Amino acid sequence: KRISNCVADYSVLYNSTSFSTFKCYGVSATKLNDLCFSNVYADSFVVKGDDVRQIAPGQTGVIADYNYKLPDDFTGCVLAWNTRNIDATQTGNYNYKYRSLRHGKLRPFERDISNVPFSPDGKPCTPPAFNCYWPLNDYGFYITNGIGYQPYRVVVLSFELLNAPATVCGPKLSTDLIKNQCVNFNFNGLTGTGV
Amino acid sequence: KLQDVVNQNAQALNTLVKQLSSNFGAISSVLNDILSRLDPPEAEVQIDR
Numbered sequence: 001k002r003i004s005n006c007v008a009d010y011s012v013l014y015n016s017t018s019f020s021t022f023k024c025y026g027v028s029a030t031k032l033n034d035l036c037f038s039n040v041y042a043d044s045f046v047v048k049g050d051d052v053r054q055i056a057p058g059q060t061g062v063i064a065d066y067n068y069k070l071p072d073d074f075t076g077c078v079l080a081w082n083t084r085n086i087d088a089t090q091t092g093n094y095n096y097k098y099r100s101l102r103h104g105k106l107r108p109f110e111r112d113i114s115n116v117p118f119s120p121d122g123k124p125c126t127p128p129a130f131n132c133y134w135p136l137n138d139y140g141f142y143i144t145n146g147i148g149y150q151p152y153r154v155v156v157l158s159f160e161l162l163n164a165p166a167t168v169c170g171p172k173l174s175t176d177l178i179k180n181q182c183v184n185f186n187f188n189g190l191t192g193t194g195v
Numbered sequence: 196k197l198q199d200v201v202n203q204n205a206q207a208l209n210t211l212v213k214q215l216s217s218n219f220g221a222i223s224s225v226l227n228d229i230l231s232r233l234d235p236p237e238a239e240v241q242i243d244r
């Protein structure tokens with residue numbers, strides 16, 4: 001989801017919930033209100049608690065290998081919370097699925113949708129033969145599952161910092177313009193000192 | 196001969212100034228920007244570079 005032309009407050013989201021995994025790599029979590037970023041992107045998914053750690057730059061895992069590879073230069077925050085109560089059920093939730101295997105690795109910030117049985121050879125396999133194995137697999141989600149197997153909901157905010165004039169600016173109060181005085185200035189995130 | 200010493204002086208100064216706007220492994224090349232985007236414990240990592 002692209003988010004533009006709106007005042008973004010970190011504090012409301014931070015006071016809202018104690019997220020399970022909350023970390024900003026290229027940004028300070030607190031300083032979000034001061035700076036402006038242009039064209040923030042929000043990526044939403046649901047993974048088991050074990051998978052949450054794998055969501056990080058320069059980290060390899062089955063999800064990272066085939067599902068979601070974060071850019072190594074990614075700048076932004078990752079927020080993740082537990083969701084066992086609403087998602088998991090006794091009988092078993094199999095809607096949430098993952099690509100266990102795939103013919104290659106996806107590029108950073110990419111989505112893969114192909115639903116065809118996978119072949120370790122990479123050449124087409126017949127479903128009966130042992131070459132074909134379903135890539136798209138799901139974790140058996142239960143209420144009795146451990147917190148690692150319990151579902152977790154993850155939202156990744158990526159900020160494009162200083163690329164262009166920033167449409168998305170945090171909540172701050174503008175002041176009057178002062179000239180001929182050596183003063184501090186912050187022009188849409190262009191912090192500096194001068195006349 | 197007089198012009199060449201002036202040219203070498205000017206080129207030295209200009210190369211010095213040009214070297215300012217350059218990441219040395221840091222995420223950015225402006226001290227202001229790194230301070231704004233990073234908390235001091237992880238700001239010092241870039242500032243030392």
Ligand SMILES: *[C@@H]1O[C@H](CO)[C@@H](O[C@@H]2O[C@H](CO)[C@@H](O)[C@H](O)[C@H]2NC(C)=O)[C@H](O)[C@H]1NC(C)=O
Binds near residue numbers: 015016017
């Ligand atoms: C859904 O959004 C609401 C509003 O932002 C969040 O509810 C707030 O929760 C905090 C602390 O839990 C309360 O102090 C606020 O009064 C609530 N806002 C209301 C009642 O309007 C809620 O946390 C969000 N749900 C999430 C993040 O899962």
